[PDB]
């Protein structure tokens, strides 16, 4: 129903992830932890580092226990190494309950901590199947569920707007964070939060590709990713169609590549010339699907300025990948996302905080009759 204590518990910088406040140790040590549905390890800085303002001091915790084992976790971008252990953990603006969980004490890292991000650790909300060093290391949320009465489920609402914000509802669904109805898509396999995209549209125009290219070699939801990552083939086709749709104005190849950034006089951004993007996702009913639609306000991430001056500049937040489709923040900032683990499904609804203009709004509609959706998945 209503979780007044957890609403608005997230923060973050643009392009630097979303984090929540947590405590660790006895007495409690406060640390900001980024929310990553793309991984399954709970790790926090535990040694001095240029980009860290504070870190986990194990010798100061009377409830700390050493597991006497190291761990290495490489991410698509960034990586760290540390020592495994456990300790008491809590979430101030979350469920009023303390739990014991495994903790990786990061002692070495590379291009992982961001200068000025404001977070000092990461909370992998995915499944143990992708936990390092192996699937035996029980993930944080799993421990929270087994040690408390909290329902096996959490929801996320990421809001664009260089501060950012949002809310992480643990154990429930807050009806005030969205409008319209919630549409669920089945979780294909429990490792990453994998789903199946069966159709892609650009301003209503179908991309017309084998619905397998959309999920090659997979499609996952990652709050820990900034852009909308798209496999090479799909990326090329989308960019082409998006270029056509906005042809009334030309931009350098650097822009579409994510290198350079476009700008416009304060408040003159021509949103209307940019196309809306829709992704159709497999539904819970056979032959049934639903679609989610985002706006250029979602895929054109605002940044500083070409000359660090005063003008509205943005960066194309849609890029290609070789590890499948990644529905990152550019997708999530448009919706309230329910990670229904108990029912092996992910729900989508229009977020009541999503950025948009008076003429257009993000959407989630259904149902659409779609045949041969099972074949859309890669093997």
């Amino acid at each position: 129903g209503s979780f007044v204590e957890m609403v608005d518990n997230l923060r973050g910088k643009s392009g630097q992830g979303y984090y929540v406040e947590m405590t660790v140790g006895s007495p409690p040590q406060t640390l900001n932890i980024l929310v990553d549905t793309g991984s399954s390890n709970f790790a926090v800085g535990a040694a001095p580092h240029p980009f860290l303002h504070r870190y986990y001091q194990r010798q100061l915790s009377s409830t700390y226990r050493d597991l006497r084992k190291g761990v290495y976790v490489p991410y698509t971008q960034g990586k760290w190494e540390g020592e495994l252990g456990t300790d008491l953990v809590s979430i101030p603006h979350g469920p009023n309950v303390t739990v014991r969980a495994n903790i990786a004490a990061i002692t070495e890292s590379d291009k992982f901590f961001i200068n000025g991000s404001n977070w000092e650790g990461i909370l992998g909300l995915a499944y143990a199947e992708i936990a390092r060093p192996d699937d035996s290391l029980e993930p944080f949320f799993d421990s929270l569920v087994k040690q408390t009465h909290v329902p096996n489920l959490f929801s996320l609402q990421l809001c664009g707007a260089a501060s950012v914000g949002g809310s992480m509802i643990i154990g429930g669904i807050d009806h005030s964070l969205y409008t319209g109805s919630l549409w669920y898509t089945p979780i294909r396999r429990e490792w990453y939060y994998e789903v199946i995209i069966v159709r892609v549209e650009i301003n209503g125009q179908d991309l017309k590709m084998d619905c397998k290219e959309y999920n090659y070699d997979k499609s996952i939801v990652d709050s820990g990713t900034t852009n909308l990552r798209l496999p090479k083939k799909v990326f090329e086709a989308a960019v082409k169609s998006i270029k056509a749709a906005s042809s009334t104005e030309k931009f350098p190849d650097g822009f579409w590549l994510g290198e350079q950034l476009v700008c416009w006089q304060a408040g003159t951004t021509p949103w209307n010339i940019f196309p809306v993007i829709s992704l159709y996702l497999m539904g819970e009913v056979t032959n049934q699907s639903f679609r989610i639609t985002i706006l250029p306000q979602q895929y054109l991430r605002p940044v500083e300025d070409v000359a660090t001056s005063q003008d509205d500049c943005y960066k194309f937040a849609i890029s290609q990948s070789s590890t499948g489709t990644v529905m990152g923040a550019v997708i999530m900032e448009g919706f309230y996302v329910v990670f229904d683990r108990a029912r092996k499904r992910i729900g989508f609804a229009v977020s009541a905080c999503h950025v948009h203009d008076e003429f257009r709004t993000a959407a989630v509609e259904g149902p659409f009759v779609t045949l041969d959706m099972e074949d859309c998945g890669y093997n």
Partner: peptide, 5 residues
């Protein structure tokens, strides 16, 4: 700017 396993 982030790409988290």
């Amino acid at each position: 700017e982030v790409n988290x396993a």
